[PDB]
Amino acid sequence: SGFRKMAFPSGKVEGCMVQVTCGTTTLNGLWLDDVVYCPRHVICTSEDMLNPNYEDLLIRKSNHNFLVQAGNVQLRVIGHSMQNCVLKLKVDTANPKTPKYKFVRIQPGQTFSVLACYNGSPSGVYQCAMRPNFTIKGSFLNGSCGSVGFNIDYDCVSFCYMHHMELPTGVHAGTDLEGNFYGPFVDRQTAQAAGTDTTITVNVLAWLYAAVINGDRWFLNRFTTTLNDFNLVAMKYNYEPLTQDHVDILGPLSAQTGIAVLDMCASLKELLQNGMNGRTILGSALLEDEFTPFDVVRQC
Amino acid sequence: SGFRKMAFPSGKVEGCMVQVTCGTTTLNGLWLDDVVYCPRHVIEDMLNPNYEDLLIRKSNHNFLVQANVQLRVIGHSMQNCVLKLKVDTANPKTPKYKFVRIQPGQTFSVLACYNGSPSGVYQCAMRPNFTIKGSFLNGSCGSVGFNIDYDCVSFCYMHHMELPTGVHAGTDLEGNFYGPFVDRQTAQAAGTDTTITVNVLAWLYAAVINGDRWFLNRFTTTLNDFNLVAMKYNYEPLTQDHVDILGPLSAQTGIAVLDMCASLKELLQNGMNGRTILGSALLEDEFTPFDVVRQCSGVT
Numbered sequence: 014s015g016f017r018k019m020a021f022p023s024g025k026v027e028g029c030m031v032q033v034t035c036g037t038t039t040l041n042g043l044w045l046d047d048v049v050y051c052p053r054h055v056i057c058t059s060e061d062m063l064n065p066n067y068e069d070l071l072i073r074k075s076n077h078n079f080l081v082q083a084g085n086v087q088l089r090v091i092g093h094s095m096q097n098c099v100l101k102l103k104v105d106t107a108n109p110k111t112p113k114y115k116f117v118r119i120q121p122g123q124t125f126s127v128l129a130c131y132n133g134s135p136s137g138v139y140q141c142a143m144r145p146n147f148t149i150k151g152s153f154l155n156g157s158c159g160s161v162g163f164n165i166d167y168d169c170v171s172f173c174y175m176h177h178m179e180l181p182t183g184v185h186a187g188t189d190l191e192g193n194f195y196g197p198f199v200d201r202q203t204a205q206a207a208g209t210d211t212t213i214t215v216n217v218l219a220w221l222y223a224a225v226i227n228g229d230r231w232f233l234n235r236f237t238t239t240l241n242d243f244n245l246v247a248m249k250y251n252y253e254p255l256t257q258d259h260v261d262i263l264g265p266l267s268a269q270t271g272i273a274v275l276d277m278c279a280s281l282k283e284l285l286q287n288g289m290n291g292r293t294i295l296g297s298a299l300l301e302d303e304f305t306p307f308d309v310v311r312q313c
Numbered sequence: 314s315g316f317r318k319m320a321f322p323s324g325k326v327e328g329c330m331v332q333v334t335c336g337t338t339t340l341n342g343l344w345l346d347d348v349v350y351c352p353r354h355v356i357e358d359m360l361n362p363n364y365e366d367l368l369i370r371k372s373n374h375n376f377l378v379q380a381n382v383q384l385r386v387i388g389h390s391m392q393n394c395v396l397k398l399k400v401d402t403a404n405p406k407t408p409k410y411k412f413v414r415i416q417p418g419q420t421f422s423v424l425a426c427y428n429g430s431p432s433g434v435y436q437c438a439m440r441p442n443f444t445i446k447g448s449f450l451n452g453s454c455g456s457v458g459f460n461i462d463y464d465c466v467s468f469c470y471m472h473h474m475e476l477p478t479g480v481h482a483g484t485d486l487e488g489n490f491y492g493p494f495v496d497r498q499t500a501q502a503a504g505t506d507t508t509i510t511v512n513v514l515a516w517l518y519a520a521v522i523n524g525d526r527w528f529l530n531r532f533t534t535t536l537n538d539f540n541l542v543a544m545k546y547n548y549e550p551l552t553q554d555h556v557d558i559l560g561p562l563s564a565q566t567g568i569a570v571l572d573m574c575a576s577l578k579e580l581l582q583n584g585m586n587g588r589t590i591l592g593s594a595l596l597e598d599e600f601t602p603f604d605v606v607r608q609c610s611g612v613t
């Protein structure tokens with residue numbers, strides 16, 4: 014029993030973290046086979062950041078302007094190209110530590126692990142979700158750009174996030190591994206606004222099912238609800254709408270616990286109305302939205 | 314910015330996990346140099362076991378140790394509550410490591426495993442009652458807890474059982490239990506837990522670092538007056554040592570520790586008056602002072 018915000022083992026990713034220096038800028042890169050991936054704003058100066066033109070800064074770069082250091086080794090760059098907001102550095106060594114991997118673009122509410130690195134050096138791993146506003150609530154100091162986020166599935170790594178910047182509100186924005194941002198952000202130091210964040214409803218339901226699986230039922234009630242009546246209440250608490258897809262996705266947890274999805278939805282409406290009255294659910298005094306149905310099944 | 318429950322990267326430790334099977338039971342082991350460490354209860358028996366005589370009756374080839382490869386067991390001995398299985402080949406992925414024993418209130422990372430395959434990593438504290446609120450299921454026995462410091466893995470915990478309240482019990486890597494527990498099927502309960510006061514005060518400091526400031530107050534208290542409120546709320550007494558340890562964060566933020574106790578003494582009586590701190594509605598006690606520093610400064 015017990016329930017933790019549990020990350021994936023970071024070792025397959027630890028072996029791909031390199032350092033990439035351009036001019037006076039240093040960030041982290043991701044070494045797979047003979048391609049090093051990193052965010053393109055490593056080619057930027059302090060005057061650039063308001064309105065850089067990256068095609069024009071890259072054309073001015075030769076292979077040997079890119080200091081790539083894999084731990085002790087200095088990798089020789091034999092080629093550079095750009096794909097959206099990620100720079101791809103070709104090098105003369107395939108990375109022997111290269112795992113089985115895929116690049117995947119996730120949908121908001123998906124969870125993944127983050128390997129925070131500074132100077133190509135892993136500092137720590139943690140779990141988080143893509144917020145519905147395509148932001149992530151991370152732990153990121155200056156210099157963490159290039160840290161990646163991932164899932165592992167039977168020794169195959171699914172890379173899904175590269176870290177590019179911190180927003181004024183304190184949260185973080187980034188891109189998939191084909192360099193396309195999540196959300197409406199750009200790699201530019203101009204005014205940029207995180208959208209209105211909202212609770213991931215289908216995740217909170219999953220977390221409540223986990224709490225039942227672990228043996229607490231104190232929050233259940235004798236009521237049910239319609240999908241539409243539930244959503245009309247949830248939205249007044251800034252919760253994400255629940256769709257039929259979500260309900261289908263929860264089917265396995267409902268079958269395991271014998272609580273209908275729409276009955277679990279009724280519990281949530283009452284939780285939102287009453288609060289928790291001095292109690293806790295799986296050690297949280299707030300309702301927890303960073304666990305997906307897959308997560309709950311994996312851990313339980 | 315941000316603040317998360319952050320685990321050490323787990324790559325050095327992943328390479329040390331193997332599968333160990335004696336008869337019907339399978340659990341995990343830790344492979345270091347030419348020895349495989351795993352709990353001694355891998356050998357009706359759990360009711361009233363005499364472990365010296367149960368091990369007498371076993372022979373090297375009773376222990377099927379899978380790393381794809383089967384390791385040949387060439388010897389078996391026991392140290393306190395851990396079985397040491399000698400193998401023919403030394404683990405070439407053996408990190409630099411120590412075995413250490415931590416005190417309650419100290420934190421560490423757990424790398425949970427099943428049939429020798431690493432499944433997840435999370436961060437957690439050793440409770441004042443010497444238990445761990447972890448996330449383990451059937452087959453997780455043998456999972457290890459560690460810290461890392463400047464390239465050296467410090468192993469501190471190995472998992473044996475789950476107690477009937479859902480919390481977990483285990484030993485240091487020399488087989489000495491944490492807390493007043495035994496590896497045997499009887500009724501065993503944990504004691505009245507308390508809250509790690511200094512880890513709450515460190516986490517309040519981390520809140521001030523990240524902008525949260527509403528809980529401070531102009532006033533001041535005495536360690537005497539504070540510890541009189543602490544006992545009332547099942548908080549650990551705050552020592553003179555504890556205050557010094559908070560020195561660095563009382564410097565960095567310019568809030569004296571006895572002031573912060575006033576802020577916390579008020580949080581204990583009046584509650585948080587419908588607010589949160591660092592995204593939690595609970596006072597968090599699983600971040601040590603050094604944990605706070607190490608995260609808000611980016612050591613790698």
Ligand SMILES: O=C1CN(Cc2ccc(F)cc2)C(=O)N1c1cncc2ccccc12
Binds near residue numbers: 153155199201314
């Ligand atoms: O390292 C960097 C560099 N930078 C500037 C920038 C990067 C990309 C752009 F497209 C535009 C601007 C930035 O915001 N970070 C950070 C990334 N994450 C967390 C941080 C916390 C504190 C300070 C910086 C943080």
